[PDB]
């Protein structure tokens, strides 16, 4: 069908056409607010691969994130501790930039909604650009649909602050299995807790 050709074209990104298009997109994304809504998905084929559906309760937003590392928070760059802990200027965060982009729109601006997924739409020396899918759990169009209404249960509130979206699965260590990820399930802290435990019989 149609979507296959878009998928093959977007695989290049260094052809003349795709380079021109990406330059034009990335210029205009700079002038708009940090968090703004769009009316349609700008990559319909890539959005279908994730959970996006053309139904009344689905919306798209766009977010802009700043790149690089964050300096450690000590005043005047003075650490009071041992030389192993005196590092600053190359400390690196546990979370992705994609997860931070999802949380910029998910925490307060659209507390009405629930976060599903996001995808890359461009980048630059200063910023990275994404697009986030949100679903409304109070509209009856999604609430009557037997395929998509798992999202309207309260155990799925704020998936992007508990690590439950795809980008959260990536940095939690749950994208690999077996002998390379042996101590990560059901969570790192719970696996650690099970191994510290001392169990002790009554009669002994």
């Amino acid at each position: 069908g149609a979507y296959k050709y878009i998928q093959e074209i977007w695989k290049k990104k260094q052809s003349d056409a795709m380079h021109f298009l990406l330059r034009v997109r990335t210029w205009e994304y700079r002038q708009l607010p940090v968090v703004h809504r769009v009316s349609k998905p700008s990559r319909p084929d890539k959005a279908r691969r994730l959970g996006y559906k053309a139904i009344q309760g689905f919306v798209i937003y766009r977010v802009r994130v700043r790149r690089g590392d964050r300096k450690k928070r000590v005043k005047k760059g003075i650490v009071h501790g041992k030389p192993k802990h005196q590092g600053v200027h190359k400390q690196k965060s546990t979370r992705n930039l994609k997860s931070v982009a999802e949380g910029k729109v998910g925490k307060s601006i659209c507390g009405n909604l629930r976060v599903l997924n996001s995808y890359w739409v461009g980048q630059d020396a200063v910023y990275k650009y994404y697009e986030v899918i949100l679903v409304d759990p109070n509209h009856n169009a999604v609430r009557n649909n037997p395929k998509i209404n798992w999202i309207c249960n309260p155990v799925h509130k704020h998936r992007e602050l508990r690590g439950l979206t795809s980008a959260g699965k990536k940095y939690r260590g749950l994208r690999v299995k077996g002998h390379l990820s042996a101590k990560s399930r059901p969570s790192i802290r719970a696996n650690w807790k099970r191994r510290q435990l001392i169990k002790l019989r009554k009669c002994r």
Binding site: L200, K202, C203, R204
Partner: protein
């Protein structure tokens, strides 16, 4: 301060438990021992004392 992980119980060898039960039934069949535990059985006929 007292703690709940004081070892409250013991585990006993199965063969010794069976030995003790057996040697305890045998002591039930000696007239002088039953008298020396405080039972008032002076008028009894036989100490094993089977009933229909």
């Amino acid at each position: 301060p007292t703690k709940i992980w004081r070892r409250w119980g013991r585990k006993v060898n199965l063969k010794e438990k069976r030995y003790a039960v057996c040697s305890s039934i045998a002591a039930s069949g000696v007239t002088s021992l039953v008298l020396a535990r405080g039972h008032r059985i002076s008028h009894l006929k036989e100490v094993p004392l089977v009933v229909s």
